C-alpha cells in the first residue's frame, strides 16, 4: 500500500497567518490527491480534489499544489473557523490511504497550571475502592507530563488520564489524572503526590497530602 | 363517291398519304381538271389512271435474319438462337401499324456460372464445415441441367475498421478470437478466393482451407462483396454466354449505404472494381457500402442473378431486399448451410422459369402493344411476360406498332429483348411518308406561275420562299 | 442540494453484527461510487471499500475482508456498510463517502454513525464529592463520576447555575465501563459559604444523582 | 426565391480538411454573426488527422479564417490503479458543430478511449466527445458522457446491456434555446443509439482539465432497449428540438434513427425524459429515412412543423423500374394534443443518385411573406451530378411543392455541395435572412445573402 506521511501533526498559529501542511506518499501519485477538513465534533468538508482543484463552496483562501509524491495545503490569512483538522488522502492505487492528520491549534501566551489534588471520598472508600483525583488546568502550550508518586516512589499502574480540547474562552489547555486503588492497598500507606511538568517551570509543579492527617 | 382522301382536299401527294393509310396518288397527266388526284386506288384505276403513276405504299414487315432455335444450348462458341427472329425490316406510312411477332425458348443445357459469396464472420463457423463437398456434389447435381458448370468462391466479413473490427490488444488484430481460446483470421472486408473454373475439386480444396474471423456488430458487410463480385468481371470470371448466379449466403443483417459514417466513412461507393493483385478489396475502409439502386444497376449491366441464401431469421429481410431489386431470388438457408445444393438447384429452376420481354431505343413516336402465348397456346393480350416455364419451353408473342403522324427521321431501329438473354430482335424500321415521284421534281416550272412554282408529281407547289 | 443521512448510532456485542445505513437525499445513489471509511482517534482513517450501487460491485480493504460487507439498494436510495463478529477494535465512527466530480475522489461525506462494542450492561454511575484538603485566594472543587455504561452523561454545577470557571473532562473507559471528573473553580470567600452541588443524569438507567460537596 | 446567386462569398480551409463537413452560424457577446466551420480531417500536431474548427469573421470577400484551438493532445490518467486513455488520432474533430449563445460546441464522434487494469481492459472504442469554448473569454470545457471504467469481461458476463463503448457522441448535436446541450450517439447500446443531455453551464462548471472521468450532475442519458425493432437502428443519427406537446414549459427532442425496424427507418418526438411522443416510420427500406429532421413551423399558424429526409428513397418509374433519387417528407403539427398524421407533402427528387434531402435548412421566412421556408439539399443532383440545393417557400397550406429557387454548385465535382446547410441567420444586417451550404469534398463554404424581392 502507499503511505501518506502527513506533516507536521501540529501547528499552533494565529489568525491572519499564512499555514502550510505538507503530505509525502512512499511513491509517486500524479496529483490524485485530495484535502479534507474535520471540525471540531463534526463530521467531514472536501476542501482539493486532484491535488489543486476546489471543491465546490470553499473558500479562496484555501490552495493545493505540489507533483510527484510531494504535496501541500496553503491557507492564506487563516480565519476563526479554519481551526480544526486537516487530513491528505490519496486515491492514485486502491486501497485509498489517509495521512496521519494535522491540528491548526491557537497560539497564545505560555501559563503554568493550576494543580490541584483531591483524596478519596468517604463514600467510595466504604465500597472498597481509593481513587485520588488530580487536576491540571488553564496551562499552555499543550505539552505536558503527570507523575504519580505514592511514599514519594513513582507509580504507574492504573492511572487514567484525559485531556480537554483547546477551550474556547482563553484557548488554554486542561487535564485530569486519576489514580485508583483498593481500599486496602490505598491505606498501606501514607504519601500522595502528583507532579507536573510543564515547560512553564524547571522545577516541576508539587500537590501532595498525607492519608489520616489532614 | 367522295371520301376524306378527297373531302380534304390536299396540295401535294406528300399531304394525301398523310390523309389516311388508305389513299393513295395518281402523278398522271391526262386527268381531268374536276377529277381529284388523292382517291381510294381502286377508284383511280377507275378513272383511268395510269398505274405506274400511282403512289400508294403499302406498311408491311419482313423478316431478314431468321435462324432457327437452337434445340440445345451445348457446343458452339455461343452460336445458340434463343430468339427467332432476329431482325426484321419495318415499314410504315403515316398514322399506319403492322404487326409482327416474335419466339423465345428457354434453352436446354446452357452453360451456367455459379459463384459461391460467403459470410465468413464468427456466426458461420459451422457453415464451413457442411459444405467442404458441395463442389462435386454441385457439379453431380447440376450435370443433370447443364455440361458446361463453372464454380467459383468468394468470402466477406465487414469493414476491417473500429468501431466494426477489435482494435486492442496489438494482438487482437492478429486473431480477434484472442480473448477467446480459439484463433481466428484477421479481419477482412472481401477477398476472392477461386475464379470461375469447370475443374470442381479445385472448389473443395479451396474451402478446406478457408477459415472465419470475428467483428463486433451483427450486420455485415456483404454488399460490398456483391458489388465487387459484379463488376470484377475479369477477376471472377463470368462467361459471356452463361447463366450467371451470384449464391449470397449469411444468417445475418447487413450493412447498407450510409452505415458507413460510423467508421468516419462519406465517400459514396463508385461501383468500380477495386480487387486487384492481392484478391482483397482495397476500398473497403475508405469507401462506402453500395446503395440497392447502384447494386441494381450493375446485377442489370453484367446480367448477374443475384441469389440471398439466408437463414429463416431474416429471410423476411432479405424477401424485402429482393423486392426492390428486381430479378433477385431468395431462398432459406439452414442454420448449418446444410442444403445449400438444393437451394441453389431450386433458385435455377426458378430463373429461367420466366421470360420477360423488354424494349430499347423505342422512338418515341412509336407505340407497341404485345399480346403472350404461354403455357399451352393460350393468347393473353396486354401481356409482354410469360411465367411458370420450364427448360425447353418455348413462348411467343405478337406485337404490333403504331407510328403518329410521321416524324423528321425517315430510318430507326429498336430493339426486343427478353431479360437477362442474350439474343434479341432488332426491329429496322422505315417511314414511308414521301412519294416516290418527289425525287424528279422540276425546280422552276415554266407551267407553274412563270417560273414561281415547282412541278412535282403532276401539280404545281409554291416554290422555296414563298 | 447533496447530502447522506447515515443511521443512527449502534450498540452492540462482541461476535454479533450489525448494518449500518447511508441514504442519499437529494440525489440519485446510483450516480457515483459510494465509499465507507472508519475513523479511530489513535489509528486515524482508514478506508474500508466501496460499492458502485449502479451494478452493486464492490471493492475492499484486504485488512477488512471479511469483517466489512458493503451493499446498495436503488429503491430506497440507500448504501449499507455490514460488520460481522465484531470486537473492541470495531468499535470507531463510520463515515459513507462520495465524489463531486472527479470519478475516483471522496469529497462528500455524511456526519459518521458511532458503534460501539460492549459486553457491559446498563450501569448506573458512582457520583462522589471531591472536596479538597485542610489556603489561597482561589479554591476548586470537583466530582467524580465512576463505573456507568453506557455513554453518555450530562453533569452540571447547582442544575445549571454555576457554569462559568468549569472543566469536564471527556469519559475515558475502565474496563467496560466509563469514568469521567469534572472540575469547578470559585474565590475563596464563595465557598463553603455557598452550597455547591453536583447535578449528574445518566439517561440509559434514567438516574439523576446529585451530592453536595462536603469540606473536610 | 431571393437569394443572390450572382454574388457569393466563398471560405476555405486546408487541402484534405474536409473543411464544410459541419457549420453553423455563431453570434458574439454583442451580437455580430461569424460562421463556425467544422474540418474534421484537418491534420493536427503529429501530422496525422485529428479535425479542427475555424471561426470565419464575416467578410464579403470570404477568404481564410482562424482556427478555434483546442487541445490534441493524447491524454494519460493513472488513477484508482486503473490507466485512462483519450486517443485523438483520427477523431475527427468538427464533424459536427453547433453554436448557442456565445458558446461553441465543436464534437469528435471518432475520438477513442480506453481504460487498463493490470491485463484487463476496457476495449478501445469510439466513445465519441465534445469541445466546448466561448471565443471571447478563453474558455475550455469537454464532454464525453460514454466515458467509462468497466473492464471487457464485465460486458460478457453481463450480455453488453448498458453497453456506451461506441456511442460516437457528437456525431449529431443540437442545443435547447435554455441551454440544454443534446447529443446523439448513434452507436450507443451496442448499436441501438442514445441521446446525451446536460446543460452548457453545468458542463463548464463540472470540468476540470485532466481528470477524462468525471460526474457531471444535470446530465441525463436515453434507455438501453430489449426491443429488436432497435437493434443496429443508429438511433440519434440526426437530431432536433421543438415544441410538439402544446405545453411551453417543456422541451421535445426529435431523434432520427434510419436504420430503424431493419432498416426501415424512423423518427421519434419525445419529452425530455426520453418517454416517446410519436413515431413517424419510414416509408421504404433502405431509405435512410431519418437521416436528417428539421423543425420549423411552415403554414403559419405558430404550431412546429417536421420534415425529414430519406435521401436513399427510390422513385417508381416506368415498366416496374426503381430510381434512387431521395425523397423529403413534411409533417404539419394539428391543433392541440393530437398525433402528427399523415404527410402533409411528398417532395421527392429528380437526378439519379442525387440524394435529395440529405440535408434539410430551416431558412427563417426569405422572402418575407409571413411564412418560414426551407432549402433542400441533393450534394450529388443537378444534371451534372455537381449538386443542387432547392428552396421552397411556406405557405398557408404547407410547402410549396415546386422549388422558387435552385443554386447549382459552384464547386467542380465531388465536392458534396449542400451535405451541410444552414439558414435563418442575418449575416449582412440587410433585413433578410441568408444561406450556408457546405461543400467539405473541395474544402470551401458558400455564402448566399437574401436580397429584396425582384
Ligand atoms: C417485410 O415486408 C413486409 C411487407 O410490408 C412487412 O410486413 C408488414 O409489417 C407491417 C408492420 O410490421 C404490418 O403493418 C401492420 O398491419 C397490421 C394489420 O395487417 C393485417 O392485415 C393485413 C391486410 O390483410 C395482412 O396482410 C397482415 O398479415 C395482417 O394480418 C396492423 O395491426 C398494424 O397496425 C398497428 O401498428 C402500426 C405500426 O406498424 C400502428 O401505426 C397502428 O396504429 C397499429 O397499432 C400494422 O399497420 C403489415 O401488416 C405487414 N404486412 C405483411 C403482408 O405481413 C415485414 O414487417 C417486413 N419485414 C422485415 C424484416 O423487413
Ligand atoms: C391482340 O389481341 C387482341 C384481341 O384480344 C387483338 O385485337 C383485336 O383485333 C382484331 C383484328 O383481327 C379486331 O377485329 C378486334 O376488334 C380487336 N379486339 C379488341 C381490340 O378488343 C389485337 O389485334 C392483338 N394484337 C396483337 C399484336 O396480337
Ligand atoms: C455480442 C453481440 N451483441 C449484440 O449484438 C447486441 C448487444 C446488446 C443489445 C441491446 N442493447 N439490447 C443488442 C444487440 C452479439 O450478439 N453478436 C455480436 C456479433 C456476432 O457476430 C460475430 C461475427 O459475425 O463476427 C453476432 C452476435
Ligand atoms: C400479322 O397478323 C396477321 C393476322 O393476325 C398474321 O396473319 C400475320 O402473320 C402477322 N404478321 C407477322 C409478321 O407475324
Ligand atoms: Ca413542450
Ligand atoms: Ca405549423
Ligand atoms: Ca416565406
Ligand atoms: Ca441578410
Ligand atoms: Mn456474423
Ligand atoms: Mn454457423
Ligand atoms: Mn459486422
Known amino acids: 500500500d502507499i503511505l501518506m506521511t502527513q506533516s507536521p501533526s501540529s501547528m499552533s498559529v494565529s489568525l491572519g497567518d499564512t499555514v502550510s501542511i505538507t503530505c509525502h506518499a512512499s511513491q509517486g501519485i500524479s496529483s490524485n490527491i485530495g484535502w479534507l477538513q474535520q471540525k471540531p465534533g463534526k463530521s467531514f468538508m472536501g476542501l482539493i480534489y486532484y491535488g489543486t482543484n476546489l471543491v465546490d463552496g470553499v473558500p479562496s483562501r484555501f490552495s493545493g499544489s505540489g507533483s510527484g509524491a510531494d504535496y501541500s495545503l496553503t491557507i492564506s490569512s487563516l480565519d476563526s473557523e479554519d481551526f480544526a483538522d486537516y487530513y491528505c488522502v490519496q486515491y492514485a492505487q486502491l486501497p485509498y490511504t489517509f495521512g496521519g492528520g494535522t491540528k491548526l491549534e491557537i497560539k497564545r501566551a505560555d501559563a503554568a497550571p493550576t494543580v490541584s489534588i483531591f483524596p478519596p471520598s468517604s463514600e467510595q472508600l466504604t465500597s472498597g475502592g481509593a481513587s485520588v483525583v488530580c487536576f491540571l488546568n488553564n496551562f499552555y502550550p499543550k505539552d505536558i507530563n503527570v507523575k504519580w508518586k505514592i511514599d514519594g516512589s513513582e507509580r504507574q499502574n492504573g492511572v487514567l488520564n484525559s485531556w480537554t480540547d483547546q477551550d474556547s474562552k482563553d484557548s488554554t489547555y486542561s487535564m485530569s489524572s486519576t489514580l485508583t486503588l483498593t481500599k486496602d492497598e490505598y491505606e498501606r500507606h501514607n504519601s500522595y503526590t502528583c507532579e507536573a511538568t510543564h515547560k512553564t517551570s524547571t522545577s516541576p509543579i508539587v500537590k501532595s497530602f498525607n492519608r489520616n492527617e489532614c | 363517291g367522295p371520301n376524306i382522301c378527297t373531302t380534304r382536299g390536299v396540295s401535294s401527294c406528300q399531304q394525301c398519304l398523310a390523309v389516311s393509310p388508305m389513299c393513295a396518288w395518281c402523278s398522271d397527266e391526262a386527268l381531268p381538271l374536276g377529277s381529284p388526284r388523292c382517291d381510294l386506288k381502286e377508284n383511280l384505276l377507275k378513272d383511268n389512271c395510269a398505274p405506274e403513276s400511282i403512289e400508294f405504299p403499302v406498311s408491311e414487315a419482313r423478316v431478314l435474319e ?53 459470410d465468413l464472420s464468427y456466426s458461420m463457423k459451422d457453415d464451413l464445415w457442411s459444405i467442404q463437398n458441395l463442389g462435386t456434389k454441385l457439379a453431380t447435381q447440376m450435370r443433370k441441367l447443364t455440361s458446361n458448370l463453372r464454380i467459383g468462391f468468394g468470402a466477406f466479413v465487414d469493414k476491417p475498421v473500429s468501431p466494426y473490427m477489435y482494435i486492442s490488444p496489438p494482438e487482437a488484430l492478429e486473431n480477434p478470437c484472442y480473448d477467446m481460446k480459439t484463433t481466428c483470421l484477421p479481419m477482412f472486408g472481401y477477398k476472392h478466393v477461386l475464379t470461375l473454373t469447370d475443374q470442381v475439386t479445385r472448389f473443395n480444396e479451396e474451402v478446406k482451407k478457408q477459415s472465419v474471423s470475428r467483428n463486433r456488430d451483427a450486420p455485415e458487410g456483404g454488399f460490398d462483396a456483391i458489388m465487387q463480385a459484379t463488376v470484377c468481371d475479369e477477376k471472377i470470371g463470368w462467361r459471356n454466354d452463361a447463366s450467371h448466379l451470384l449464391v449470397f449466403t449469411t444468417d445475418a443483417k447487413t450493412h447498407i449505404a450510409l452505415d458507413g459514417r460510423l467508421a468516419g466513412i462519406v465517400q459514396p461507393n463508385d461501383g468500380q472494381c477495386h480487387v486487384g493483385s492481392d484478391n482483397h478489396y482495397s476500398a473497403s475502409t475508405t469507401m462506402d457500402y453500395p446503395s440497392l439502386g447502384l447494386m441494381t444497376e450493375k446485377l442489370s449491366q453484367k446480367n448477374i442473378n443475384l441469389i440471398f441464401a439466408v437463414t429463416e431469421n431474416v429471410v423476411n429481410l432479405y424477401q424485402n431486399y429482393s423486392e426492390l431489386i428486381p430479378g433477385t431470388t431468395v431462398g432459406v438457408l439452414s442454420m448449418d448451410s446444410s442444403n445449400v445444393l438444393q437451394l441453389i438447384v431450386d433458385a435455377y429452376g426458378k430463373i429461367r422459369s420466366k421470360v420477360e420481354l423488354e424494349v430499347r431505343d423505342l422512338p418515341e413516336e412509336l407505340s407497341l402493344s404485345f399480346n403472350a402465348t404461354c403455357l399451352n397456346n393460350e393468347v393473353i393480350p396486354g401481356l409482354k411476360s410469360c411465367m411458370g416455364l420450364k427448360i425447353g419451353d418455348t413462348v411467343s408473342f405478337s406485337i404490333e406498332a403504331k407510328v403518329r403522324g410521321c416524324p423528321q427521321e425517315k430510318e430507326k431501329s429498336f430493339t426486343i429483348k427478353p431479360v437477362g438473354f442474350k439474343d434479341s430482335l432488332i426491329v429496322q424500321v422505315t417511314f414511308d411518308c414521301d412519294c416516290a415521284c418527289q425525287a424528279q421534281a422540276e425546280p422552276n416550272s415554266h407551267r407553274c406561275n412563270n417560273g414561281n412554282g415547282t412541278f412535282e408529281c403532276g401539280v404545281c407547289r409554291c416554290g422555296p420562299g414563298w | 442540494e447533496v447530502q447522506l443521512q447515515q443511521s443512527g448510532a449502534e450498540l452492540v456485542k462482541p461476535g454479533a453484527s450489525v448494518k449500518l445505513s447511508c441514504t442519499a437525499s437529494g440525489f440519485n445513489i446510483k450516480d457515483t461510487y459510494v465509499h465507507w471509511v472508519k475513523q479511530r482517534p489513535e489509528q486515524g482513517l482508514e478506508w474500508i471499500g466501496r460499492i458502485d450501487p449502479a451494478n452493486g460491485y464492490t471493492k475492499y480493504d484486504p485488512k477488512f475482508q471479511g469483517k466489512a460487507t458493503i451493499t446498495a439498494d436503488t429503491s430506497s436510495n440507500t448504501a449499507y456498510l455490514q460488520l460481522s463478529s465484531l470486537t473492541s477494535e470495531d468499535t470507531a465512527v463510520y463515515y459513507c463517502v462520495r465524489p463531486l466530480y472527479d470519478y475516483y475522489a471522496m469529497d462528500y461525506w455524511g456526519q459518521g454513525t458511532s458503534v460501539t462494542v460492549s459486553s457491559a450492561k446498563t450501569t448506573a454511575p458512582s457520583v462522589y464529592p471531591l472536596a479538597p484538603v485542610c489556603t489561597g485566594s482561589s479554591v476548586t472543587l470537583g466530582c467524580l463520576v465512576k463505573g456507568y455504561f453506557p455513554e453518555p452523561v450530562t453533569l452540571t454545577w447547582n442544575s445549571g447555575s454555576l457554569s462559568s470557571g468549569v472543566h469536564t473532562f471527556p469519559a475515558v473507559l475502565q474496563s467496560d465501563l466509563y469514568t469521567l471528573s469534572s472540575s469547578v473553580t470559585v474565590t475563596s470567600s464563595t465557598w463553603p459559604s455557598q452550597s455547591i452541588t453536583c447535578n449528574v443524569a445518566h439517561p440509559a438507567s434514567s438516574t439523576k444523582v446529585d451530592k453536595k460537596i462536603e469540606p473536610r | 426565391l431571393n437569394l443572390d446567386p450572382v454574388q457569393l462569398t466563398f471560405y476555405a480551409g486546408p487541402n484534405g480538411s474536409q473543411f464544410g463537413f459541419s457549420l453553423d452560424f455563431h453570434k458574439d457577446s454583442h451580437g455580430r454573426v461569424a460562421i463556425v466551420v467544422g474540418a474534421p480531417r484537418t491534420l493536427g500536431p503529429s501530422q496525422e488527422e485529428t479535425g479542427g474548427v475555424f471561426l470565419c469573421p464575416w467578410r464579403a470577400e470570404g477568404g481564410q479564417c482562424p482556427s478555434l484551438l483546442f487541445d490534441l493532445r493524447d491524454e494519460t490518467r493513472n488513477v484508482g490503479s486503473q490507466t485512462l486513455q483519450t486517443f485523438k488520432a483520427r477523431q475527427g474533430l468538427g464533424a459536427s458543430v453547433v453554436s448557442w449563445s456565445d458558446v461553441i460546441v465543436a464534437c469528435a464522434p471518432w475520438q477513442h478511449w480506453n481504460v ?137 427532442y426529435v431523434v432520427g434513427a434510419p436504420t430503424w425496424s431493419w432498416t426501415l427507418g424512423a423518427v421519434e418526438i419525445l419529452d425530455s425524459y426520453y418517454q416517446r411522443l410519436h413515431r413517424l416510420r419510414g416509408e421504404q427500406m433502405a431509405s435512410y429515412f431519418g437521416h436528417s429532421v428539421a423543425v420549423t413551423d411552415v403554414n403559419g399558424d405558430g404550431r412546429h412543423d417536421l420534415l425529414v429526409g430519406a435521401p436513399l428513397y427510390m422513385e417508381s418509374r416506368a415498366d416496374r423500374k426503381l430510381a434512387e433519387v431521395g425523397r423529403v417528407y413534411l409533417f404539419l403539427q394539428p391543433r392541440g394534443p393530437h398525433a402528427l398524421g399523415a404527410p402533409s407533402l411528398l417532395l421527392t427528387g429528380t437526378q439519379l443518385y442525387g440524394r435529395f434531402g440529405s440535408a434539410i435548412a430551416p431558412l427563417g421566412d426569405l422572402d418575407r411573406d409571413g411564412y418560414n421556408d426551407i432549402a433542400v439539399a441533393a450534394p450529388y443532383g443537378g444534371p451534372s451530378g455537381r449538386g443542387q440545393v432547392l428552396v421552397f417557400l411556406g405557405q398557408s397550406e404547407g410547402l410549396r411543392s415546386r422549388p422558387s429557387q435552385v443554386l447549382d454548385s459552384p464547386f467542380p465535382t465531388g465536392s458534396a455541395f449542400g451535405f451541410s446547410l444552414r439558414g435563418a441567420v442575418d449575416i449582412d444586417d440587410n433585413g433578410y435572412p441568408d444561406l450556408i451550404v457546405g461543400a467539405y469534398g473541395a474544402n470551401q463554404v458558400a455564402v448566399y445573402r437574401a436580397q429584396p424581392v425582384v
Not at chain 2, 427472329?85 to 434453352?107: E, G, H, M, T, Y
Not at chain 4, 476496457?122 to 466561448?134: D, I, N
Open chain 2, 66 to 118: 431468321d435462324r432457327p432455335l437452337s434445340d440445345k444450348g451445348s457446343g458452339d462458341s455461343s452460336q445458340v438462337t434463343q430468339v427467332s427472329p432476329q431482325r426484321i425490316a419495318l415499314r410504315l406510312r403515316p398514322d399506319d401499324s403492322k404487326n409482327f411477332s416474335i419466339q423465345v425458348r428457354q434453352v436446354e443445357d446452357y452453360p451456367v456460372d455459379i459463384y459461391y459469396l460467403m
Open chain 4, 116 to 252: 487498463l487494469e493490470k491485463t484487463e481492459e476496457a476495449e478501445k472504442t469510439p466513445v465519441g466527445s465534445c469541445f466546448l469554448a466561448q471565443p471571447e473569454s478563453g474558455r475550455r470545457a469537454e464532454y464525453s458522457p460514454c466515458r467509462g471504467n468497466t473492464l471487457s469481461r464485465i460486458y460478457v458476463e453481463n450480455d453488453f446491456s448498458w453497453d456506451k463503448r461506441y456511442c460516437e457522441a457528437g456525431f449529431s448535436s443540437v442545443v435547447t434555446q435554455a441551454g440544454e446541450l443534446v447529443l446523439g450517439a448513434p452507436g450507443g447500446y451496442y448499436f441501438l443509439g442514445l441521446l446525451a443531455q446536460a446543460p452548457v453551464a453545468d458542463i463548464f462548471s463540472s470540468y476540470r482539465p485532466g481528470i477524462l472521468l468525471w460526474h457531471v450532475s444535470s446530465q441525463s442519458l436515453s434507455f438501453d432497449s430489449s426491443n429488436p425493432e432497435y437493434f443496429d437502428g443508429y438511433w440519434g443519427y440526426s437530431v432536433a428540438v421543438g415544441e410538439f406537446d402544446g405545453d411551453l414549459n417543456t422541451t421535445e
